[PDB]
Each structure stands twice: as structure tokens, then as C-alpha cells.
Amino acid sequence: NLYFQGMTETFAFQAEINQLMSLIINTFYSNKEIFLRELISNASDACDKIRYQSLTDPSVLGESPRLCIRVVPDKENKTLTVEDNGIGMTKADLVNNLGTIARSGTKAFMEALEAGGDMSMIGQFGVGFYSAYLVADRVTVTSKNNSDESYVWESSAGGTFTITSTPESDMKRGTRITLHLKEDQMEYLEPRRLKELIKKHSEFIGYDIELMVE
Amino acid sequence: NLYFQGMTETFAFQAEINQLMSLIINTFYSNKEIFLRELISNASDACDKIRYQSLTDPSVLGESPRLCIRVVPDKENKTLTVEDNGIGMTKADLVNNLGTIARSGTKAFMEALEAGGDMSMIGQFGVGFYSAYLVADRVTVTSKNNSDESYVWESSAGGTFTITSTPESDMKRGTRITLHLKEDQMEYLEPRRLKELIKKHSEFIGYDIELMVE
Ligand SMILES: Nc1ncnc2c1ncn2[C@@H]1O[C@H](COP(=O)(O)OP(=O)(O)NP(=O)(O)O)[C@@H](O)[C@H]1O
Numbered sequence: 243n244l245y246f247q248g249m250t251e252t253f254a255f256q257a258e259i260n261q262l263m264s265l266i267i268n269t270f271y272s273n274k275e276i277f278l279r280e281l282i283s284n285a286s287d288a289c290d291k292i293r294y295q296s297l298t299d300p301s302v303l304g305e306s307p308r309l310c311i312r313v314v315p316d317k318e319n320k321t322l323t324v325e326d327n328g329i330g331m332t333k334a335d336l337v338n339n340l341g342t343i344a345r346s347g348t349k350a351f352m353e354a355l356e357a358g359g360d361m362s363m364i365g366q367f368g369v370g371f372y373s374a375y376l377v378a379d380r381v382t383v384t385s386k387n388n389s390d391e392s393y394v395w396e397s398s399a400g401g402t403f404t405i406t407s408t409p410e411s412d413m414k415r416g417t418r419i420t421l422h423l424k425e426d427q428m429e430y431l432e433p434r435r436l437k438e439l440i441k442k443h444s445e446f447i448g449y450d451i452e453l454m455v456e
Numbered sequence: 457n458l459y460f461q462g463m464t465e466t467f468a469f470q471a472e473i474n475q476l477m478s479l480i481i482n483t484f485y486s487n488k489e490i491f492l493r494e495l496i497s498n499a500s501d502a503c504d505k506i507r508y509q510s511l512t513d514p515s516v517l518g519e520s521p522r523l524c525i526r527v528v529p530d531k532e533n534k535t536l537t538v539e540d541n542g543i544g545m546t547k548a549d550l551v552n553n554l555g556t557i558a559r560s561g562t563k564a565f566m567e568a569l570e571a572g573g574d575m576s577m578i579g580q581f582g583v584g585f586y587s588a589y590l591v592a593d594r595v596t597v598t599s600k601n602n603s604d605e606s607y608v609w610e611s612s613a614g615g616t617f618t619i620t621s622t623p624e625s626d627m628k629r630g631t632r633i634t635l636h637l638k639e640d641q642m643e644y645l646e647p648r649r650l651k652e653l654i655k656k657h658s659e660f661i662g663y664d665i666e667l668m669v670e
Pocket residue numbers: 280284285287288326328329330331339340364365366367368369370371372416417
């Protein structure tokens with residue numbers, strides 16, 4: 243116990259979610275940039291949730307009351323990160339909401355694509371997050387909700403994901419989604435590509451989005 | 457939860473135990489065969505403990521009342537295994553007894569070796585198990601005690617060990633110690649080497665020891 247350093251639990255994906263991930267991670271698609279819109283939307287949604295809570299109980303904001311979104315390329319590590327200081331996800335949120343519960347939208351989306359529907363429709367089917375696998379071969383979600391400890395969710399779409407906990411874990415409310423970019427997707431590490439992509443959706447989002455240039 | 461597949465926890469070694477493992481795993485020594493005596497002794501001790509319990513409560517033996525020890529080389533995987541159906545180790549036994557508690561024997565043994573004492577004295581200092589690192593670069597201990605679930609302890613002597621649990625875990629009371637043999641220690645995979653080594657200590661042990669020839 244005094245010698246404990248941390249724990250990793252492994253979970254299977256719900257069956258349809260697994261099938262959707264395999265579909266997305268393997269598919270050719272000519273418009274893979276929509277992943278960024280999906281991650282920014284989730285960040286903005288998470289900021290809404292804590293913002294609304296803070297309107298009745300301001301103390302939920304703790305020492306981080308300025309709600310915003312950051313986009314962070316890392317050429318050395320070949321990762322792109324979207325971070326927010328929104329509501330964050332409990333352990334239960336991570337397991338339930340990112341893999342083990344499927345709604346009818348999951349199956350419908352695959353049926354829609356099999357019928358020549360558009361991958362860019364992914365958000366309309368309730369599975370927007372999984373668009374990250376268009377451009378990435380591994381995704382890591384680090385999240386902290388006021389009600390729980392910090393956890394790291396991780397998956398390379400092999401049918402399972404892990405949830406990792408460490409006894410001193412980071413204390414900052416929010417979520418960081420980090421994408422390990424596929425060989426041919428190095429263009430999303432380029433600040434010029436990112437800055438226009440952000441501007442393209444920035445119009446629709448009521449929180450500052452800062453691009454961190456290395 | 458219904459999707460849970462298992463968990464791995466990581467622990468630091470007690471400081472002196474870590475130092476002893478580094479000493480043992482790195483050291484030249486001309487008589488490394490004593491590791492086998494140490495593992496067979498532990499197996500025989502574990503069989504004594506359940507045997508004695510069964511004398512007042514025979515039902516502790518369940519469906520495995522014949523107490524014995526097996527030695528199992530595996531040339532394909534380059535592993536040597538010593539298995540018993542003795543008392544087994546609870547989760548707490550594995551963490552407490554194989555890494556996080558040091559007695560004064562640990563420090564004394566290193567002081568003894570620094571003074572030109574013998575590595576073969578290891579058993580007299582209460583640290584016999586760690587002799588496995590003379591011949592192996594990783595050790596895995598799978599154990600099941602009547603009072604607990606099955607767990608796997610694992611370490612390559614890098615300062616930590618892991619404890620792994622799976623929700624359907626094996627049900628057989630006992631312990632299997634598996635050694636991944638170092639490059640130059642392939643001779644302990646040879647049945648002729650093993651059979652004499654066993655015979656050399658078989659005289660001192662009141663349980664059958666069977667060598668499993670591939
Ligand atoms: N940055 C984040 N902060 C907090 N929760 C998040 C974040 N990203 C994802 N989630 C949670 O994960 C769930 C899955 O996200 P996602 O697959 O994008 O679905 P969605 O946003 O609910 N609907 P849609 O994106 O329109 O298909 C969300 O409902 C949130 O509960």
C-alpha cells in the first residue's frame with residue numbers, strides 16, 4: 243500500500259462501437275479534417291456544462307474560472323492535443339460514455355455509410371469522438387471532474403481500452419484529448435493548417451480557442 | 457463493469473530489496489544452480505503449510521489432495537517453471553512477502569557478500585526467492601490461496617513489480633514460479649541438467665518432484 247504506484251484496468255468495447263472503430267481507423271476518406279471540429283465541439287460542450295453549474299454555484303470553478311480551449315501540436319512526439327477546462331469526466335463517465343454503452347446511432351451510422359452517406363455526418367449519429375481515428379492510431383483522454391480523481395483513458399482500437407489511475411494524479415479540472423497521428427497525417431502538426439481549421443469553426447463556438455505554437 | 461477484462465497494479469520494491477535485486481541480477485557468480493534449491497524449498501514449505509492445515513480440516517485440500525512439485529522446462533519460450541499445489545499466496549501475501557517488507561536479513565546479506573561471503577548463503581538471510589535473478593531476467597509468480605482470488609506477480613528487477621488480476625482467473629490452489637532465462641543460462645532447459653539438480657536436493661524433501669520432459 244505505501245508502495246503503490248498506480249493501476250491500469252482494461253475494458254472491452256461494446257460490440258458495435260468496436261466495429262465502428264475498426265471501420266473508421268481502416269477507411270479511406272478524402273476529408274479527414276472534420277475530426278478537429280468534433281473535438282472542439284466536445285470541448286465547448288464540456289465548458290457549457292461547468293459554466294451553467296457555476297451560475298448557481300460559482301465555487302465549482304475553483305481556481306480555474308476562465309473557460310477556454312487549447313490546441314497543442316507536438317512535432318517531436320507526433321501528437322495533436324485538444325485541451326479544455328470544462329466539466330471533466332469521472333471514472334464512470336469515461337467507461338460509460340467512451341466505449342461500453344452504444345446507442346442505436348452507432349449501428350445506424352455504419353448502415354448510413356454502407357449506403358453511401360457521408361463520414362462527416364458522424365456527429366449527427368452521436369459518435370463524433372471516434373472521428374479521431376480517421377487521423378490517429380492511438381488516442382489518450384486525460385480527464386478530471388470535481389467529484390472524482392483524475393484518470394487516463396487509452397485505446398488504439400484493438401477492441402479494448404484502458405483506464406489508468408495514479409495515486410498522486412493531476413488536479414486540474416478538465417480534459418485533454420491527445421492523438422498520436424498516423425504516418426500520412428503529419429499535416430495536422432502544422433500551425434498554418436491548424437490555425438485555418440480553427441478559424442473555420444471558431445465562428446460557431448463561444449469560448450476562446452488558443453493555438454499553442456512550438 | 458460487464459466489459460471489465462482485468463487489472464494490473466504497480467508497486468515499488470522496499471529500498472533494500474531493490475538494491476539486493478540489482479546486486480543479484482548484475483553479479484557474476486560461478487555457482488548459479490542454487491536458485492533451483494531455493495525454489496524447490498519454497499514449494500516444499502508451501503506444501504507443509506496446507507498439509508498441516510488439512511490435518512485438522514481436510515476440506516482445505518478440495519479436489520487436489522495429492523501434494524507435489526513439478527519442474528517444467530520450456531525450450532520454445534526459454535522458461536523454467538517450478539509449480540506446487542501448496543498453500544498459495546493471497547494478494548496481500550504477494551505484495552508483503554515478495555517485495556514491500558524487508559527484514560534486517562536483506563541488508564546483512566549484502567554486507568556479507570561485500571565481505572567475501574557466499575551467494576549460496578542467500579537462504580540463511582531470509583531472501584532465498586531472489587536467487588532466481590541469478591539465472592533469470594524476469595520472474596512471474598502465479599498463485600491461488602483458498603481465501604482469495606488468483607493473482608500474478610511479475611518483475612524484471614527495474615525497481616517495481618506488478619500484481620495482475622483477471623475476473624475469471626484460474627481456480628487451482630498453489631503457486632507457479634516461471635523464470636525467463638538469461639541468454640547464457642539456457643542449460644537449465646536441459647532435462648539432464650535438471651534431473652541431476654533435482655536428485656541433488658530430492659533427498660532433503662518429503663514430496664514427489666516430477667520433471668516434465670517436453
Ligand atoms: N472534452 C470532453 N469533456 C467532457 N466530456 C466529454 C469530452 N469529450 C467527450 N466527452 C463525453 O463523451 C461522450 C461522447 O462524445 P461524442 O462521441 O463526441 O458524443 P456527443 O458529443 O455526445 N454527440 P455528437 O458528437 O453530436 O455525436 C460525450 O457525450 C461526453 O459525455
